[PDB]
Amino acid sequence: LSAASFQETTRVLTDAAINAKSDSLIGLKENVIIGKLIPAGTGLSRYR
């Protein structure tokens, strides 16, 4: 998901479908897509 949101959006979509890659949602750019809390600063498990 983060790779798709970068420059390539066809090759990354195409090979992910072939490879069948499940995206674990840990990270920053992909947690902005879904609307969840970014794991950075106040969004951490310990602070929140």
Partner: protein, 77 residues
């Protein structure tokens, strides 16, 4: 008469971090607002403002004032 009225250096040393402080003041501010919205139920678990309050005030402003006194206590789970 400003945002900077409770100084930040005094607040910082109480909580030992910076991100810890903002959520800690915010969690308390949520509680005190919820207390004001009982409107007659008077549920036991909520607790009102510990410090005196102006005629009009923001609940977050009250929360930061409580930290400077240091009566309020936070604990990470």
């Amino acid at each position: 008469e400003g945002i900077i009225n409770p100084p930040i250096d005094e607040l910082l040393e109480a909580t030992d971090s910076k991100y810890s402080l903002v959520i800690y003041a915010a969690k308390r501010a949520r509680q005190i607002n919820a207390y004001y919205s009982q409107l007659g139920e008077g549920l036991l678990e909520y607790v009102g403002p510990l410090v005196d309050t102006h005629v009009h005030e923001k609940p977050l402003s009250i929360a930061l004032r409580e930290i400077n006194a240091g009566l309020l206590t936070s604990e990470a789970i």
